[PDB]
């Protein structure tokens, strides 16, 4: 994929929900029209989703010290990648996942 | 140990070595001093060791990154921990062991 990710031919099959419609009370006498009157509804719950990764471990003879990615060790208003005074989250930068080397 | 380390009552034992004195050649009548004309000599060698660690593996439910060892990131004359044009190994700068966090 362009935008970077793992191009699959079958991906994870796309969940689709719904709430269930259920009519307002019909009119006493039959009518062909469809039932245009429905209960305002809405549905909540929990959601769950586990998934199992393959490492490739890294194995290296490089003498010197890699690259990592690391906090800043510097005093700060408030910790990064955690809930500011008010509860909101923030995340205050990308980070991408190439830190370590190979021999080209 | 007050300069840090492990104190051990029974460390790893000293391992003494020495070249064998060899006499030059002691005069053809008796005498009763000791011999006190050598060989001048020296021995060189490979020396090995191996030692097993048994480590602790971090465990921690922490939600935001930690701060870890990462080398300069930016340009400079020479590589940190490798060797100068004139062949001169150098370690830029002492590095401790604690950059990982517990709770106290």
Redesign the interface.
Same mark, same amino acid.
């Given at each position: 994929p362009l935008m970077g990710g793992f191009g699959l031919k079958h991906p994870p099959p796309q969940i689709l929900i719904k709430n269930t419609p259920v009519p307002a009370d019909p009119p006493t006498t039959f009518s062909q029209a469809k039932l245009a009157s429905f209960i305002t509804q809405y549905s909540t719950g929990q959601v769950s989703v586990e998934i199992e990764w393959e490492l490739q471990k890294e194995n290296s003879k490089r003498?010197?010290?890699?690259?990592? *990615?690391?906090?800043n *060790?510097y005093k700060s208003t408030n910790?990064?990648?955690?809930v500011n005074t008010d509860g909101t989250y923030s995340e205050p930068r990308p980070i991408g996942t190439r830190y370590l080397t190979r021999n080209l």
């Open positions: 003498w010197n010290p890699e690259i990592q *990615y690391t906090s *060790y910790v990064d990648f955690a």
